[PDB]
Symmetry: C3
Subunit: 63 residues, 3 copies
Amino acid sequence: NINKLKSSIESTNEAVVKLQETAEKTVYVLTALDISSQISSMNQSLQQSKDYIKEAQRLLDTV
Amino acid sequence: NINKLKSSIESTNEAVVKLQETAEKTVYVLTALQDISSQISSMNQSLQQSKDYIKEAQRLLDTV
Amino acid sequence: NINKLKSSIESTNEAVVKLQETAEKTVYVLTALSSQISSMNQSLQQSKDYIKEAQRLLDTV
């Protein structure tokens, strides 16, 4: 149960890293206002984040 | 203590999902800036839920 | 290990509070449209550190 929880939380942290990365890009775009390249970056980082949290929930349900 | 931790993480995850919904709206508004008020309103919606969720996780975590 | 997990999840949660704060300031800069942007950077870097620490503490579980 502990190893599981540990596994689930690890994926949760990955998801947070990705949103942070996404927030990072947002900061850059706000200043500006190559936004096109940043908007794409933001979207993919947000993609991985969403996959990451879905895996976290899925595993958590395993506990 | 496990069920508590698990229940704590669940709300954490929900809070994470809500930031993600807020971020996707961000990407949309930033794109647009090139209804925006309705989108911002929407960002506040999911951002409030996110805060409610993590406040839930935090409270639950103290229960362990 | 129940202690480390909890301690590690606490940093995760703090990391999330910081992202929400970063998000709030985001809504603020969006409605505005400098210092607010610097503020954003601040709560975001804090988030980065808190998440960094959660991982580290996690690794010892």
